[PDB]
Symmetry: C3
């Protein structure tokens, strides 16, 4: 109403319009998904602006056969990620590091492993604060308003990611390329004109 | 049982067999969807019988570039929709008229804007009657029986529309063309023989 | 916990993790589906090992035009299913027999038709026993443990069948051929390498 006039509501703010809100755990899920989606969309966006490589084919740059092609990708970097001819980055090193670091972080967050700190943060609280609000924005501002803004950005980013998935399938081009083609000539470059062309299959 | 012996039941008539009936609003949704589906299937059907143009490609006839191709399509019409060479119908005129008329009707029905009449019709009642039963069939006949017949036609039309969607995807032909091909040789023209051919992709 | 430490639980054993357990009928459904899935996966598996013909195209061997190609397929058989040149098996005979036998069995199981026996077996009980446990394993062992093992095999076989569906769509080869290609070179033959190749469409 006042803070959420848009379609639907927030958990603790009313009744869901279509899919019933029956489990509180879903609330946590919705936030976690949302945070990842934000990092996803931004990432895809930024990377395509920096390298021209669409997000859905970037994985081919790093395989056990070769992962050196990513070494010089990052814009403005004072040096490549590894020297030329050193055979680095190595795919297995990247994979082992990701497994260890992200697995440990997720285990600490979800209660699989006991926390390394002794601050009493609660497992299952998607807004824990403390060390995870190091600049103290949640105590200097309005916590409930900030949570609503965060939830809205979560939902928007997830819907944008769904759009990215199906735009990739339907156009076989990057999302930034889709955006450029639309803004150049919106009447003649959109989903309906693409469908008239058969989406590349019909 | 007596009035609904077929699989399932109707809202207020028992328990849903598979997907639970939990919200009364879904009941309204089911009727509204259903009415559109009827107009949809009939439309596709009739248009393909009159013009030979399948429903899933008829949109390409009317674009901002050109919409005059629809002028002479309606069978038996004493004149085209607009004179030849006049540049009409115009896509923008069609779009604006649809937005105004259908938007106003939907707003009146859904309570977004107040009703233009003062008859006290209830917003949210999918069977309001009154001016929407001008011939008075609901009071001359059995209202509950007529509502059951309407609900059955709603469900049947919606399932037929789902069939139209997937038949279009699988055969790339109009639904009436599918019907003719099946009745001409049903053993050798059906979904299984189409699947053996790969649905045009395998 | 003790008997079901894996993710999730069993009906009567706790709360469903994601999709709520609200109807007891679904429990029966899950078992019946599961049993068919086992027979499915096994069947596909065994048939591909015996004939080399993938499960998703085996139907083309038997149509009203011709069903003699199946006569000599079964490995080690002392004779073909019918004499050569006899025009058998006939598709219509196979179809009629399947309809009569499987339809009668399903009607007896589901209470559509009254049971031919007078043993008092309960319709709706997916673990009836009696004549359906002729070797008496359910009373010689632990019934609850055996039911848990059966439920686990049900769920595993259903997930494997879902894998078979999408592997057929993505690779256009038999599931056993997929297994051989993966085990021969798992780093270079998997879903990611197939995706880099476009799944045959991109
Ligand atoms: C968040 C994780 C993550 C995601 C989403 C992707 C996604 C992708 N990678 Mg990448 N990767 C990820 C992590 C990583 N990748 C790689 C390394 C590679 C390589 C080397 C390659 C890829 C490739 C691909 C693409 C093709 C995959 C495919 O078959 O898509 C088909 C699948 C879909 C279209 C959607 C399927 C989703 C669905 C099955 C599950 C969704 C279910 C819901 C979660 C829940 C549903 C509800 C429940 C109740 C039923 C795809 C864009 C390939 C590529 O780029 O090819 C061009 C490729 O070659 N990746 C690494 C190692 C550093 C990762 C490590 O984190
Ligand atoms: C001389 C050094 C140097 C320079 C001039 C640039 C310049 C650029 N980089 Mg590159 N980079 C540099 C070194 C490096 N970059 C990266 C990694 C990246 C990434 C991941 C990205 C860029 C991007 C960009 C562009 C941002 C344009 C824009 O609109 O910014 C807008 C202005 C701002 C964002 C404000 C300026 C940022 C400033 C506050 C410093 C930020 C610090 C870091 C985030 C690290 C510290 C984090 C925490 C601890 C504080 C720009 C061309 C972006 C791009 O490609 O855009 C399309 C991008 O996404 N760079 C690495 C690591 C390999 C570098 C190391 O050598
Ligand atoms: C009810 C409205 C309506 C519908 C269903 C369609 C449908 C269609 N139009 Mg048409 N139009 C409609 C109104 C209008 N059209 C046009 C003008 C045009 C043009 C100019 C063109 C089309 C075209 C098309 C087709 C290709 C679109 C596409 O990308 O399909 C792909 C999408 C799908 C196959 C399915 C998508 C459904 C899914 C994404 C959402 C479903 C969600 C559920 C409703 C809810 C789910 C549950 C929740 C809880 C999650 C398609 C048959 C194009 C065409 O004919 O190409 C040959 C074309 O060029 N239309 C006008 C202007 C007069 C309309 C006016 O209202
Ligand atoms: C000389 C005039 C004239 C004639 C002879 C025809 C003849 C035909 N039109 Mg065509 N039309 C004519 C003028 C017009 N038509 C249309 C719009 C349509 C449409 C939208 C359709 C046809 C269809 C048909 C065919 C119906 C075949 C059938 O089985 O009907 C079955 C017999 C009946 C339905 C009963 C006879 C109808 C009768 C009750 C009059 C109907 C009145 C209107 C619905 C208006 C009612 C308004 C309300 C407020 C009372 C037939 C070839 C249909 C078609 O293509 O079929 C494949 C079709 O869907 N016509 C327009 C507007 C552009 C016309 C204006 O000039
Ligand atoms: C001389 C007779 C004869 C021989 C030597 C074989 C040999 C073979 N058959 Mg073939 N069959 C024979 C006659 C027949 N077969 C079949 C129908 C099948 C089928 C449906 C299948 C085979 C399969 C197999 C192979 C099993 C390999 C394995 O690892 O087994 C592992 C070892 C065992 C399973 C143990 C040995 C079985 C033993 C307990 C006897 C089973 C009796 C019967 C099931 C009938 C009795 C049922 C109830 C009452 C107990 C093997 C090459 C399988 C295949 O293709 O594998 C890839 C397969 O799925 N055969 C029919 C009916 C048309 C036959 C009749 O003439
Ligand atoms: C996985 C992500 C996710 C999750 C877990 C939730 C969870 C929740 N949402 Mg949220 N929501 C999401 C995404 C998600 N949402 C997105 C993307 C949007 C923007 C469109 C919204 C918009 C939204 C609104 C407006 C409202 C909620 C509400 C709710 C709550 C009740 C509904 C529920 O339990 O849904 C759980 C069920 C699901 C998440 C299943 C979603 C439906 C399926 C069919 C997915 C269909 C799309 C799928 C991605 C297709 C993939 C195809 C493939 C080929 C790629 C609950 C806390 C309501 C609320 O707060 O009530 C108090 C509410 O009013 N959500
Ligand atoms: C935040 C979400 C978001 C945004 C900003 C965009 C933006 C864009 N999309 Mg994308 N898209 C989205 C979600 C989004 N999409 C989703 C969820 C899907 C999956 C259905 C798609 C599928 C898709 C395809 C297949 C294509 C685009 C295309 C485009 C571009 C051209 C505009 C167009 O045709 O839009 C069309 C928008 C959609 C198909 C999404 C509609 C989602 C729901 C809300 C349907 C409602 C439609 C109805 C008329 C409005 C209801 C009233 C109210 C809710 C507003 C543009 C850059 C086209 C492109 O690349 O052109 C170059 C193109 O071909 N999008
Ligand atoms: C969107 C249309 C729609 C809606 C809103 C409803 C709503 C309802 N139906 Mg109805 N129904 C529909 C279509 C619809 N039905 C169709 C097409 C049929 C014919 C097959 C039926 C047959 C039917 C029966 C037999 C019964 C009901 C019942 C019910 C009620 C309880 C179930 C429920 O809440 O479902 C709401 C949930 C949904 C509408 C989601 C549907 C499932 C999803 C996964 C969609 C799957 C198909 C999808 C279109 C695929 C798209 C693919 C894409 C690529 C194009 C409720 C009032 C029961 C009742 O009256 O109980 C008292 C009952 O017994 N319905
Ligand atoms: C049709 C098969 C089926 C059925 C009827 C059930 C039914 C049940 N399961 Mg079981 N389950 C299944 C398959 C099935 N399961 C599979 C394959 C697995 C292994 C992954 C499991 C794993 C599992 C666990 C771990 C648990 C359950 C639980 C439950 C219970 C609560 C959930 C519920 O009601 O779901 C009914 C709703 C559905 C079956 C819909 C499923 C979701 C849809 C969207 C389908 C998505 C995939 C689909 C096939 C895509 C097709 C694409 C097409 C192009 C081919 C209920 C008795 C819970 C329980 O026992 O709680 C006490 C529980 O903890 N199940
Ligand atoms: C719920 C509900 C309630 C109401 O009552 C009604 C209604 C509103 C209808 C409904 C709404 C129903 C509904 C639910 C829903 C869910 C969606 C879309 C969820 C999407 C999650 C997306 C995530 C986590 C994305 C993560 C991306 C990463 C990690 C990317 C990472 C890389 O991309 C990077 C950065 C670079 C690449 O190169 C490499 C990779 C790929 C790794 O969508 C919906 O519509």
């Amino acid at each position: 109403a006042d803070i959420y006039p848009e379609f639907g509501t927030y958990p603790g703010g009313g009744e869901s319009p279509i899919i019933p809100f029956g489990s509180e755990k879903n609330a946590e899920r919705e936030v976690i998904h949302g945070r990842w989606a934000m990092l996803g969309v931004t990432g895809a966006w930024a990377a395509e602006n920096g390298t021209g490589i669409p997000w859905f084919t970037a994985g081919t740059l790093c395989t056990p056969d070769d992962c050196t092609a990513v070494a010089d990708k990052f814009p403005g970097a004072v040096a490549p990620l590894a020297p030329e001819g050193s055979g680095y980055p190595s795919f297995w090193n990247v994979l082992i590091i990701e497994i260890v670091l992200v697995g440990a972080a997720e285990a600490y967050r979800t209660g699989i492993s006991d926390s390394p700190f002794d601050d009493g943060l609660t497992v299952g609280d998607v807004n824990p604060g403390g060390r995870f609000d190091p600049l103290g924005l949640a105590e200097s501002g309005d916590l409930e308003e900030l949570k609503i803004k965060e939830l809205k950005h979560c939902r928007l980013s997830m819907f944008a990611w769904l759009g990215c998935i199906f735009q990739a399938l339907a156009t076989q081009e990057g999302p930034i390329a889709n955006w450029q083609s639309h803004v150049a000539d919106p009447v003649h470059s959109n989903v309906l004109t693409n469908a008239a062309k058969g989406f590349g299959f019909y």
